């Protein structure tokens, strides 16, 4: 019973999170059967602090799918966006 939520983060100057998972990754601490990308840490006073939470699964960023991608590709993409990052996340209600 999850839902897809759209969250806008304004880099200031970063997003303010750490992520894990991906194809060929070593899993994640939330859903071990899922090779997707998960938020593992959010800076407490950072740009994502009232918007994202550990456990969120990132499935899209500025229109780019995060399904079936490797962690390195997700990291490079998120770092390359300069300002607005519009995420679709899957979150437990």
């Amino acid at each position: 019973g999850s839902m897809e939520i759209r969250v806008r983060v304004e880099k200031d100057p970063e997003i303010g999170f750490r992520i894990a998972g991906g194809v060929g990754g070593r899993g994640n601490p939330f859903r071990p059967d899922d090779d997707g990308i998960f938020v593992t840490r959010v800076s407490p006073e950072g740009p994502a602090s009232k918007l994202l939470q550990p456990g969120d699964k990132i499935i899209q960023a500025n229109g780019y799918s995060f399904i079936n991608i490797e962690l390195g590709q997700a990291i490079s993409l998120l770092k390359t966006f300069q300002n607005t990052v519009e995420l679709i996340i899957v979150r437990e209600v």
Binding site: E14, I15, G16, F17, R18, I19, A20, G21, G25, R26, G27, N28, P29, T40, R41, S43, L71, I75, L78, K79
Partner: peptide
């Protein structure tokens, strides 16, 4: 598991 650095 492997965590990215901060971004």
């Amino acid at each position: 598991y492997y965590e990215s650095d901060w971004l």
